[model samples]
Target chain A: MLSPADKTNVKAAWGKVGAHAGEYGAEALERMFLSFPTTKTYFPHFDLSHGSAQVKGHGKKVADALTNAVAHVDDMPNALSALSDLHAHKARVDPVNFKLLSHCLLVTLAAHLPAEFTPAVHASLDKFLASVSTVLTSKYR
Target chain B: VHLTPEEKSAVTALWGKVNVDEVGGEALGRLLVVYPWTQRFFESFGDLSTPDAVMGNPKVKAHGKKVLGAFSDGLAHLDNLKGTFATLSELHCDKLHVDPENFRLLGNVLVCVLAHHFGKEFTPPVQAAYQKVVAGVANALAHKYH
Candidate 1:
């Protein structure tokens, strides 16, 4: 559903996102954990309570995945398959958490890339994240 | 790039039926036997001869679950498939050192296995849709190498 120009917008915005991957990716995960408290259950050993190393590390982990995802937008399913498998099978994460993360990602992008994240870019990114969400949760049965 | 609603439903339904724990191992078994060199990557299944033997192996079954599940996941995100293909291509080519030809071989074997399992329900239209998916994945997975 992404137009050529929409792809361009997404690519441009994601460039800035990759540059500040640490800050934005961590913030997004933090927001996801806070907004959807149930998601924290999957990370019992990790300190995702607030400002913690686990949160930062997990956030960067997610950020790197997103950066790879953005670069390979069409290849999301394969690119993130390991993460999807880990969450779905090993951790048994609730599928709804993906949707929560998607929403939180929008908020994170908006907060971090205010100037470059326009309405069109927001819509494009949302669509992309939706695909990511769908793939990540596809194994839930 | 979107499957028609009917196509999507057919695929999801068909996938639910055949994309089980054993399906992947069987398909991989077929691939390894027909093209023996492919077995090198799966150190666990290297000595297996028959598909039955491969399916019995725990590691083979786990690999099957992941690879077969990937196809189902890929179907849900056809709108932007390039990313999935690109990433898989890198992993298979760079990491596993799987030949590009082997992916195509595996794709064909998978379709054969699915068709054999589905019988009459795998009508012409359904087969067409399934082939499209298989081709899409094969092409995407092999995109970078060629």
Candidate 2:
């Protein structure tokens, strides 16, 4: 469980994030591609080249989902279960990819919220993403 | 709302000034500070040395551009305004769980920002019309949540 202070910090950072959802989101997806190049295979149709609108849209989708996840932190299963269902069944993303993307997300948040992205914030996000991974992977089992 | 062409021109002209990165950043920074309650949502930005500093922050600037750009798009699509804001409604209402009241607060801040920019030209009628526009934008997004 996150400490009350940690939750407060997390929520506050996320709140500021809503306005720039597309930009930060696109950056995060770009980072995911760089860090885990193999993940790009999932979107064969996408140009995946830097600054492509397709990449931007996909990045925003991830950001949008994470934004929703922040609001529904206490109920992560509800937050991600549907997305997980789609990814697992339809997208058929390798479960390992989720963990890889989570790391990239942390990097993105750290860059965006340098002051608030402290150790405590990271720890809480780690826990949150763990739950996200578990719930997302559950369908595979 | 039934804005005359002149009223639309008034709003759009002023909006164009702040659509740029520097101006939009300043406007958004002002909005965050003037409505301190809105700052609660942006904890990271809260600790910045000055709201002006927030404007300079890369993340804040990026987000400001996206938001201001969206407003530009919204103005262009006033004919299909509901469709324009509906996507925002889904994100804010269904996903992010933002309080609907904040949408109204945003309209207030936007009007204040416009007034600051337009000065004497921001007549009472113009203000009222823009208020209606803001209210329309907010109400459109607020419906899905309700």
Candidate 3:
């Protein structure tokens, strides 16, 4: 789904992000709720104020989902199919929220790994998140 | 937000024959349709209760054209998206209280409209650049919230 150059950047960059996936996921979620408060509507039931433990724990889940993307960058649908159905059908969350989280996810990684987040890597991450977003939202359309 | 020369070329190449009126209209129009709550911000556009109503509205398309025009500005200043959207970011996020997340819906909806229209020209690399464009566009527009 990505260009050869993009694949390499995504693969190599994953080595750094994978280890800190737990950390980065929380930061990304934090950024999302902070930057776009509308997204928090999805998590209204949870405690989303500053430094909420539930959000932190949810970030762990975020990394787990994204870790699948790291491994299945080329074949996201098959890997993320279950989660896709869950979000698109059961959860009934709006599909567009994926892109919202995807953006915040990009900024979180970029903020932490500035040295590694080159434009090439930046574009690579964009492709990775988009692929995951599409797959998770696939059942909707 | 500094797109590579090749990235810039691919994006501009894809945007080459884009009919902004059609795409911009569909993008924002579809956004209002898909997420009905989004229409709250555009009540002034009026009568967006139905998908067809949103899609066919003249004011919606006109504003949609302006939305894509901002994207055109991003394409031109691939290296300076932050600067390009600085004021506009404040307008949406700070003053108007428009949720920044909605921009991604608009961005990706614009992507869908492009791919639906452009077909083969919207290759993976071009799509990559386009996604990057929207990411940065969303980020720049959401900057004021930071």
Best DockQ goes to which candidate? 3
Question: Could you report the DockQ of all the candidates, in the order they appear?
Answer: 0.01, 0.01, 0.07
Better of 2 and 3 by TM-score: 3
Question: Which pairs in model 2 have colliding backbones?
Answer: A20-B63
Candidate 1 lDDT over residue span B1-146, tens digit each? 45787877887788776646678877877776665445556765544566666657777767877888787678777765668778887776555645455667788888888878878988989877777777778777776552
The lDDT of model 3 is: 0.81
Fnat scores for every prediction: 0.00, 0.00, 0.07
> Any runs in candidate 3 off by more than 4 Å, and if so which?
A1-141
| Candidate 1 Cα outliers beyond 4 Å, as residue runs | B1-146
Candidate 2 whole-model C-alpha lDDT, 0 to 1: 0.68
lDDT of 3 by residue, A66-92 (tens): 887778777778988899877754565
How much is the lDDT of residue B44 in candidate 2?
Answer: 68
TM-score of each: 0.47, 0.47, 0.54
Q: Of the candidates numbered 2 and 3, which has the greater DockQ value?
A: 3
Q: Which candidate leads in lDDT? A: 3
lDDT of each: 0.74, 0.68, 0.81
lDDT for A51 in candidate 2 is: 81
Chain A alone, TM-score per model: 0.88, 0.88, 0.93
**What lDDT does candidate 3 reach at residue B100?**
73
